[PDB]
Structure 1
Amino acid sequence: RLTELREDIDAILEDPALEGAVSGVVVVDTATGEELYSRDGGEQLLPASNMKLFTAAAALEVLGADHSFGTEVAAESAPGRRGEVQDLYLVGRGDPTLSAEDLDAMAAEVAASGVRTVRGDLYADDTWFDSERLVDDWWPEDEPYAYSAQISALTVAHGERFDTGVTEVSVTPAAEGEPADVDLGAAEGYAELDNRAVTGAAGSANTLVIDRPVGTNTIAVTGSLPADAAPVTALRTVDEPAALAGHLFEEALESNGVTVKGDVGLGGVPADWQDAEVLADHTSAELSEILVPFMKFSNNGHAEMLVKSIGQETAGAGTWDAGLVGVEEALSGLGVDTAGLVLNDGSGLSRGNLVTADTVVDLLGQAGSAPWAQTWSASLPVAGESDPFVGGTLANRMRGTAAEGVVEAKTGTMSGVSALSGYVPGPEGELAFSIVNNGHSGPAPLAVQDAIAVRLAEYAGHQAPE
C-alpha cells in the first residue's frame, strides 16, 4: 500500500488529453501531514473557479460567518399629514441575495410608513461599492451572460440561486412565420427589445439567439424557433444593475399604493441631507448560508461582491484593489503562504489569476481547522448528489462511485483551464487534494480528475454503491 496509489495516479495522468498540458497534482493526508502524492506542486497555474476557495475563506475571516447585508430606502424627511416625500433613495449595501419579493416588502413598508406620493425622483444609490462594474481583463464578448454580470452594491438577484445583475428572458413560440413572443423579465420597461426572431415550422432548425450587444442596454433577439419547440428561457445581463433595481422598486411602489411623480435614475444620497428618514430596511441571510448558492453553483457575481465587501470592512472601499489585498492579507493571517498566489479577482474569471497546487492544499489544511470550517466545508459541491443544492457542479459527476456523497471538492473551469480541489474524508485519514490543469488542446480532463478522486476515495477506505 501507499506505493500502489502512486502507480495508479501516475497511470491516470498519461491520458491523450494531457498532450501538451501542465498538471498540478497534490494529495495530502490531513491527519498524518503526509505528502501522499505531489507533482508540479509549486508550478504556477490559472485556477479558474478554484479562486473561489480563497475568496470564500477570506470572506469568512474578514466578514464573519454571521455577516448580513442590508438594503435601505431613504427620503429627506418622514411623510407628514399629506403623505408626501420628495426624492426617494434606494440605498443598497452589497446584498447578493436581493429579490423582487424584497423590493415589494420594502414597497409595502414605504406605503405603511405613510408615503402616498413621491413628488420627486426615485434614485438608485449603489455608491457603497465603486462604479467599476467589470474587472480589467474580462471579455466584452462574455458581457451578456450571468457569469459576466456587472458588479454593483445595488443588484437584483434572480432565482433561489441568486444570480445577480440578470433578467430571465422568455421566448415562447407562436405560429409558423409569425414572430415569437419575447418576454424581457424584470428588465421589461428598463431594457430595450430588438426582437427579430421568427417562429419557424414544426420540428425545424432551432437557431434562436438572445444577445445584449456591447455597450448597449438592448436585448437583441435573433434566429428562429420551431412552432413545436419547448418555450425558451435564458439569463441575460442589463447595463447598470441598480438602475434596474430602481425601475423594479418603481413598479413595487406603484403596486403598494404609492404614486411616483418623477423619473428614475442613478443617484447617491446627497451630502447636504442632514438627518435622513429611513422608510424601509432589509436584512439578507447570514453569510454562512449565502455560501451555499455561492460555492455550490460557482457564483461569480457573489465572489466579486464579497471581495468589494471585503474592501469595505478593512478599508472602507468597495473596490477590487482594496478587497484583493484584504483577501491576500486574511489568508496570510490564516497560516497560508501567499508566495504562489496572484489575485486579479474573486471569482477566478480573470485570466490574471495564478495558483499553485501546494498553495491550494495549504489553504485546505488551514481552512479545515478554522472556527468556520464546517460551513465552508458544507458550502462546497458534493460528488454525485442529485439535489442541485448539495450536488452543485458535481451533481452529474462521479455517480455510482466510491466518491458519491463523499468527496467535498470545488471545481474550476474555463477555456483551457480545468480544476478540482478539496476534501476526501476517509476512515484512513481526511484527504485534501488539488488537481489543476492548464492549456489542454482537446476535451476537458474531467475524466482524469474524477479518476484521481475516485481512486483517492478508495484509498481513504470507501467503496462504490451497488
Structure 2
Amino acid sequence: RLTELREDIDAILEDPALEGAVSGVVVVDTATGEELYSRDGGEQLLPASNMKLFTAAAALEVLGADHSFGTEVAAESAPGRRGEVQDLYLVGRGDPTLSAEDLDAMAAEVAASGVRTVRGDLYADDTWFDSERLVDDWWPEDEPYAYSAQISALTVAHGERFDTGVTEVSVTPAAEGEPADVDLGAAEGYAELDNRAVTGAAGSANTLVIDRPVGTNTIAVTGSLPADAAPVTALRTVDEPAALAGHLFEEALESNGVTVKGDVGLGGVPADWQDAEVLADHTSAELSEILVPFMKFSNNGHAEMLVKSIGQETAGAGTWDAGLVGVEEALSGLGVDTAGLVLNDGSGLSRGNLVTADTVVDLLGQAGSAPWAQTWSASLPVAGESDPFVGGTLANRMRGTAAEGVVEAKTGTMSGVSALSGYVPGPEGELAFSIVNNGHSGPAPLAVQDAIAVRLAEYAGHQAPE
C-alpha cells in the first residue's frame, strides 16, 4: 500500500507532458508526520498562485480572522444651517471588497448628515498604503488585465468576486458596417475611449480586441464584432483606482442630492485639519469571509492589499518591503522554516517568488493546527464542486473521481508554471501535499496534478461518486 503508491506516483510523473520540467512533489501524513512521498522537495520553484498560501496564512496570523476594513468620508467641519462644506475626503483603508453600492450608502449618509453642497473639491485619499501601484518585475504587457490591476488603499471592487480596480467593458454589435457600441461601465467619464471597432457581417469572424495601451488611461477598442454575436464583456483595469473611486463617488453624491461644485482628484487629508468631521463610514466583512473569494478564485489584488495591510499592522507602513518582511516573520512565528522561500509579492504574480514543496507542506502542517485552521481550510477550492464559491478554480477539475468533494487545494498557473497543493482528508488520516512544476513546455500539466491528487484520495480511502 505504501510502496504500491510510490511506484504509482513515479509512473504518473513519467508523463511526456513533464518533459524537461522540474517537479517538486511531496506528501506527508499529517497525523503522524510520516513522509509518504518526497521528490525534489528542497527544490526552489516559482509558485505562481500557491504564494497565496503563505500570504493568506500570515494575514490570519497578523490581522486575525476577525479583522475588518474601513472607509470614511471627512469634511474639515460639520455642515451648517446652509448645509455647506468646502473640500471633502473619501478615505480608504485598504478594504478589498468595497463596492459601488457601498459608495452609494455612503453618499446617502453624507446627505442624511446635512451636506447639500460641497462648495470645494472632492478628494480621494488612498494614503494608508503608498502609491507604488505595481511590483517591479510584473510585466507591462499584462497591465490591462484584472489580475494585474493597480494597487491602492482606495479601490472599488467589481461584483460578487470583488475584483479590485477594474471596469467592465461591454461591446455590442450594431448593424453591419456601423461602429460597435462600447460601454465602459464604471469608468464612463473617467477613462478615455478609443473606439475603432466595427460590426462585421453576420457570421463573419469575431476579431474584436479590448486593451488599455501602456501608460494611458484610455480603452482602445479595435477589430470587428459579428452582427449576430452576443455582446462581449471584459474586465479591463484602469489607471489610479482611487481616482475612479473618487469619480464614482461624485456620481453617488449627485445621485443623493449632494452637489459637488469643484473637482475630483487625488489628495490626502491635510495635516492642518484640527478635528476632522467624519460624515459617513463603512466597514467590510471580516477577513474570514473575504478569504473565500480571495482564495477560491485567486484574487491577486486581494493578496497584495493584504500584504500592505500587514505592513500597516506590524510597522505602520502600507508598503511592499514592509509587508513582505511581515509575512516571513509571521510564518516563522507559526513554526514554519522559511529558508527556501523568497518573497517578492503576496499574489505570486511575480517571477521573483520562489518556494520549495517541503516549505509548502511545512506550511500546510502548521496552518492545520493553528487556532484559525477552519476558516483557512474553508477558503480553499474543493475538487470538482460545481458551485463557483465552493469548487472555485477546481470547479471543473476531478469531477466524478475519489477526489471529488474531498480534496481541498490551491492551484497556481502561468507560462511554464503549474501548482496544486492542499489536503486529502481521510477516514485514515488527513494528508497534506504539494505538487509544483516549472519549465514544462506544453500545456499546463493538470492531468498529472489531478491523477496524483486522485491517487491520494484513494489511498486515503475514497471512491468516485456515481
Structure-2 separation of matches of 1:441 and 1:268:
48
Q: CA deviation at 1:343?
A: 0.1
Q: Deviations over 1:219-278 (max 9, x none)?
A: 000001000101110000000000000000000000000011001000000000110000
> Could you tell me how far apart the structure 2 residues matched to 1:123 and 1:444 are?
45
CA distance in 2, matches of 1:443, 1:215: 32
Question: For structure 1, which runs of at least 5 residues remain unmatched after alignment?
Answer: none
Structure 2 gap segments, 5+ residues each: none
1:388, 1:146 → 2: CA distance? 18
For 2:435 and 2:204, how far apart are their aligned partners in 1? 43
Across the two proteins, how many residue pairs are aligned to each other? 466
- Following the alignment from structure 1 to structure 2, what is the Cα–Cα distance between the partners of residues 443 and 270? 53
Partner Cα distance (1:230, 1:437) in 2 = 38
Aligned-partner SS, 2:371 = coil
| Mapped partners of 2:127, 2:465: distance in 1 | 52
**Aligned-residue offset at 1:298:** 0.3
Deviation at 1:15, TM superposition (A): 0.4
SS of the residue 1:35 aligns to:
coil
Q: Distance in 2 between matches of 1:241 and 1:212?
A: 14
Distance 2:429 2:119 in 1: 66
Secondary structure of the residue aligned to 1:393 is helix
- C-alpha deviation, 1:149, in angstroms: 0.1
1:28-83 superposed Cα distances (whole Å, 9 cap, x missing partner): 00011100000000010010000000000000000100000000000000001000
**Residue 147 of structure 1: SS of its match in structure 2?**
helix
Q: 1:439: Cα distance to partner? A: 0.8
Matched residues in 1 for 2:18 and 2:99: separation? Answer: 43
Match of 1:37 in 2: 37
1:18 Cα deviation from its structure 2 partner: 1.1
Give me the identity figure in percent: 100
Shift of 1:203: 1.1
- Secondary structure in 2 aligned to 1:282? strand
Distance in 2, matches of 1:118 and 1:250, equals: 10
Deviation at residue 443 of structure 1 after TM alignment: 1.3
- Summarize deviations over 1:190-223 as a string: whole Å, max 9, x none: 0000000001111110011000011100000000
* Aligned equivalents of 1:458, 1:208: Cα separation in 2: 46
SS at match of 2:28: strand
The answer for the alignment partner of 2:279 in structure 1 is 279
Measure the CA separation in 2 of the matches of 1:273 and 1:27. Answer: 57
Distance 1:411 1:390 in 2: 14
- Could you list the per-position Cα deviations for residues 159-211 of structure 1 after superposition, in whole angstroms to 9, with x for gaps in the alignment? 10000000000001111000111000000000000000001111110011000
Counterparts of 2:168 and 2:59, CA distance in 1: 29
Q: Tell me the CA shift for residue 432 of structure 1.
A: 0.3
Deviation at 1:455, TM superposition (A): 0.5
Match of 2:424 in 1: 424
Which secondary structure does the structure 2 equivalent of 1:389 belong to? helix
Matches of 2:192 and 2:397, distance apart in 1:
39
SS of equivalent to 1:412: strand
Distance in 1 (CA, whole Å) between partners of 2:2 and 2:429 is: 13
Confirm or deny that 1:201 pairs with 2:196: no
Match of residue 221 from structure 2: 221
Distance in 2 of aligned mates of 1:213 and 1:113: 42
Deviation per CA, 1:373-396, whole angstroms, max 9, x where unpaired?
000000001100000000100000
Question: In 1, distance between residues paired with 2:173 and 2:245?
Answer: 29
**Distance in 2 separating the partners of 1:351 and 1:435:** 18
Rounded to whole Å, the distance in 2 between the matches of 1:140 and 1:248 is 26
1:372 offset after TM fit, Å? 0.3
| Distance (whole Å) between structure 2 residues aligned to residue 362 and residue 451 of structure 1 | 22
| Mapped partners of 1:212, 1:296: distance in 2 | 27
Shift, 1:318, TM fit = 0.7
Partner SS state of residue 53, structure 1: helix
Q: Distance in 2 between matches of 1:465 and 1:76?
A: 62
TM-score, normalised to structure 1, is 1.00
Counterparts of 2:33 and 2:153, CA distance in 1: 42
1:465 positional shift: 1.1
Partner of 1:256, secondary structure, is coil
C-alpha displacement at 1:428, in angstroms? Answer: 1.4
- Give the TM-score taking structure 2 as reference length: 1.00
Q: Distance in 1 between matches of 2:43 and 2:168?
A: 41
Q: Deviations over 1:277-319 (max 9, x none)?
A: 0000000000000000000000000000000000000000010
Structure-1 separation of matches of 2:87 and 2:32: 63
CA deviation profile, 1:414-441 (whole Å, cap 9, x unmatched): 1100000000001111010000000111
CA distance in 1, matches of 2:31, 2:64: 27
Q: Distance in 1 between matches of 2:16 and 2:308?
A: 41
Alpha-carbon distance in 1 for matches of 2:399, 2:175: 42
SS in 1 for 2:142: coil
Moved over 3 A (4+): none
Secondary structure of the 1:429 match is coil
Q: Deviations over 1:328-362 (max 9, x none)?
A: 00000001000010000000000000000000000
Distance between the aligned counterparts of 2:204 and 2:385, measured in 1? 35
Which whole-Å deviations, capped at 9, do the CAs of 1:82-101 have from their partners, x for residues lacking one? Answer: 00000000000000000000
Q: Does 1:315 align with 2:315?
A: yes
Distance 2:147 2:16 in 1: 30
Q: Secondary structure at the match of 2:206?
A: coil
Which position in structure 1 is the counterpart of 2:76? 76
- Residue 65 of structure 2 aligns to a residue whose secondary structure is coil
Distance 1:284 1:457 in 2: 37
For residues 130 and 150 of structure 1, the distance between their equivalents in structure 2, rounded to whole angstroms, comes to 12
RMSD over aligned Cα atoms: 0.4
Local SS of the residue matching 2:23:
strand
SS for the counterpart of 1:305 is helix
Distance 1:442 1:154 in 2: 39
- Equivalence map 1:198-277=2 (5 Å): 198-277=198-277
SS in 1 for 2:60: helix
C-alpha separation between the residues in 2 aligned to 1:195 and 1:465? 50
In structure 2, what is the Cα distance between the partners aligned to 1:203 and 1:401?
A: 40
Q: State how far apart, in whole Å, the 2-side matches of 1:18 and 1:94 are.
A: 41
Aligned to 1:151: 151
Give, in whole Å, the separation in 1 of the partners of 2:125 and 2:465. Answer: 53
Residue 425 of structure 2: SS of its match in structure 1?
strand
